[PDB]
Amino acid sequence: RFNLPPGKSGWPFLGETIGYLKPYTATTLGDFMQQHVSKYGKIYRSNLFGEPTIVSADAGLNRFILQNEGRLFECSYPRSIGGILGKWSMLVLVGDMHRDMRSISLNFLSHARLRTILLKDVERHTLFVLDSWQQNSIFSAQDEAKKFTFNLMAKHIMSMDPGEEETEQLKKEYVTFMKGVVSAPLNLPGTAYHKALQSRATILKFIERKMEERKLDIKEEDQTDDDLLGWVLKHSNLSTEQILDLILSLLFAGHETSSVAIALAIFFLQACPKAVEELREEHLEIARAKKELGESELNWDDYKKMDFTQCVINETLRLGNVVRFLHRKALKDVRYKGYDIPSGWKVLPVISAVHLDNSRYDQPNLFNPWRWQQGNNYMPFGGGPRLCAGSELAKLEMAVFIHHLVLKFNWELAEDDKPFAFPFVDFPNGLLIRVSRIL
Ligand code: HEM
Ligand SMILES: CC(C)(C)[C@H](O)/C(=C\c1ccc(Cl)cc1)n1cncn1
Ligand SMILES: [Cl-]
Ligand SMILES: [Cl-]
C-alpha cells in the first residue's frame, strides 16, 4: 500500500464530484463556480477532468448543447471513467449500441410497467424501510433512502430480495465502487480508485453468477423475463460483456440519484412546515378514500391524486439540483454568443443554472412548492436525446416514499446547524435526522 504525500482528494479544482450531488464528499464545486462566473461571466474556459473545458452557466447555450447531441456535441466522460463503468456502459457510450441500450432501458422503465408492476413494489420497498425506523435515534436519511432505492432496483434487475444477506453485501460493494467516479483516477494500492476497481471485479463476478442461474431458468421454463437480467437474455442480442456492463450501470444509476432526491425532499420539508401540512392533508385524503373502499395497496389512481406532492417534487429537484452539470465534447467548432468552442474540447453544461435564474423564477433561492400551482426553464433530468430514462420511476419513488413518510413520522435535523446556503446543497454527513412516530 502506497503512502502518498498528502494533498487534495478527488478531481483537480472540484474535489470529489463528477457533476452530481454525492453525499459524504469533499467538494469545492460551489466556490469554483461562483468565483469563475463572477470573474469571467456565464461562459468561461478552464481545465477540468484533465482537458481544456468550456463551462456553461448559460441557459440558452445549455439548451443548444443538449438539443444538438450527435451533431455538434456528444456525451464524453474522462477516459478513466471507462475503467470504472466499463467499455459498454450506456452512460458513457455513443453510437448504435447506446441507442439499443437506451431502447432496452426505456422498455424496462416504461409508463406501462410503472402502472402495472413497479408501483406495487415501490410501496412494498418503501414500507420495508420505514417499518424498521426507530424514534429519537440519530440516523442518515441518505443511507435509508439508498436502502430503499437500491432494494427496489436490485429486485427488478436481478430478482434479489430486500434484507437478504446477498442484497446487503452487494449494496455495500456498490459504495466502494461508486466512490471511484469522484476519486482521483490513481490506480495504486490503497487509493479509493484502486478499491473501486476491485469492487468492480467483485460486482461483475456476482452478476455473471446470476446470469448463469438465469440462463438455466430460461431453459427450464422453456420446457422468466420478469427481471431485467432475464428480459435482456431473452429479448436482446447483447454479448455477455455488454449485459454485464448494462446491469452494473443501471443498478448504479437506479439508486444513486433518486436516493439523493429523497434526502433533499426530507431536508427542504423540515424547513417548510406549511408544505408538510399540505402534504399530510393530501395523503390523509388519499388514505381515507382507500379505507372507504377497503383497499390497502396504492394504485395508479392514487398516484394521480398526489397533486401537491408533484409540486414538492418539482421544487425539490429545481432547488436541490441533484445533477449540477453534464459531460459533453464538441464534435465541431461551434460559435455561440460570439464565443468559439473549439472542436474536441470538453463542454460542461451546468444544467442547474437555469433553475436558479431570477429571470426565470421569482425568488429562485427559496423553497416554494406553491410556485408550481402557478419544461423550458426546468431540466433536472436533462434534455434532448439522452433525457433520463428513469425520470418517471424517480418521481414515483419520491412520491410514494413521501406518502408513507408524512403519514407515519415527523422528523427533524440532528442539529439545527443546516441552513440552505445557495448555491449548492451538500450532505457531507449523509443528512442526519431523528424521527417521531405520529401514532
Ligand atoms: C432524481 C433522480 C434522477 C435524476 C436527477 C436523473 C438525472 C439524469 C440526467 C440529467 C440524465 C442525462 C444524462 C446526460 O445527458 O448525460 C439521465 C440519464 C439517464 N438516467 Fe437518470 N436520473 C434520475 C434517476 C434515474 C433512475 C431512478 C434511473 C433508472 C432506474 C435512471 C436512469 C437513467 C439512464 C439509463 C440514463 C441514460 C439515458 C441515455 O443515455 O439515453 N435515472 N438521468
Ligand atoms: C449523474 C448523471 C445523471 C449525469 C449520470 O447520467 C448518471 C449516472 C452516472 C454516474 C457516474 C458517472 Cl461517472 C456517469 C454516470 N445517472 C443517470 N441517472 C441516474 N444517474
Ligand atoms: Cl416562479
Ligand atoms: Cl449532511
Curated annotation (Swiss-Prot):
Which PROSITE patterns does the annotation name?
A: CYTOCHROME_P450
Gene3D superfamilies reported in the protein's UniProt record: Cytochrome P450
Q: What is its main location?
A: membrane
Q: Which cofactor does it need?
A: heme
UniProt catalytic activity: a C27-steroid + reduced [NADPH--hemoprotein reductase] + O2 = a (22S)-22-hydroxy C27-steroid + oxidized [NADPH--hemoprotein reductase] + H2O + H(+); a C28-steroid + reduced [NADPH--hemoprotein reductase] + O2 = a (22S)-22-hydroxy C28-steroid + oxidized [NADPH--hemoprotein reductase] + H2O + H(+); a C29-steroid + reduced [NADPH--hemoprotein reductase] + O2 = a (22S)-22-hydroxy C29-steroid + oxidized [NADPH--hemoprotein reductase] + H2O + H(+); cholesterol + reduced [NADPH--hemoprotein reductase] + O2 = (22S)-22-hydroxycholesterol + oxidized [NADPH--hemoprotein reductase] + H2O + H(+)
Q: What is the membrane topology here?
A: Single-pass membrane protein
Q: Which UniProt keywords apply?
A: Brassinosteroid biosynthesis, Heme, Iron, Lipid biosynthesis, Lipid metabolism, Membrane, Metal-binding, Monooxygenase, Oxidoreductase, Steroid biosynthesis, Transmembrane, Transmembrane helix
Q: Which CDD domains match?
A: CYP90-like
Q: In which tissues is it expressed?
A: Expressed in stems, leaves, shoots, and roots, with a higher expression in siliques and apical shoots.
Listed InterPro entries: Cyt_P450 (IPR001128), Cyt_P450_CS (IPR017972), Cyt_P450_E_grp-I (IPR002401), Cyt_P450_sf (IPR036396)
List residues binding heme.
Answer: C388
Name the GO cellular-component terms.
endoplasmic reticulum; membrane
Briefly, what is this protein's role? Catalyzes the C22-alpha-hydroxylation step in brassinosteroids biosynthesis. Converts campesterol (CR) to (22S)-22-hydroxycampesterol (22-OHCR, 22-hydroxyCR), campestanol (CN) to 6-deoxycathasterone (6-deoxoCT), and 6-oxocampestanol (6-oxoCN) to cathasterone (CT). Can also use cholesterol and cholestanol as substrates.
What family is reported?
Answer: Belongs to the cytochrome P450 family.
State what protein this is by name.
Steroid (22S)-hydroxylase
Q: Which organism is it from?
A: Arabidopsis thaliana (Mouse-ear cress)
Organism taxonomic ancestry = Eukaryota, Viridiplantae, Streptophyta, Embryophyta, Tracheophyta
What gene is this protein a product of? CYP90B1
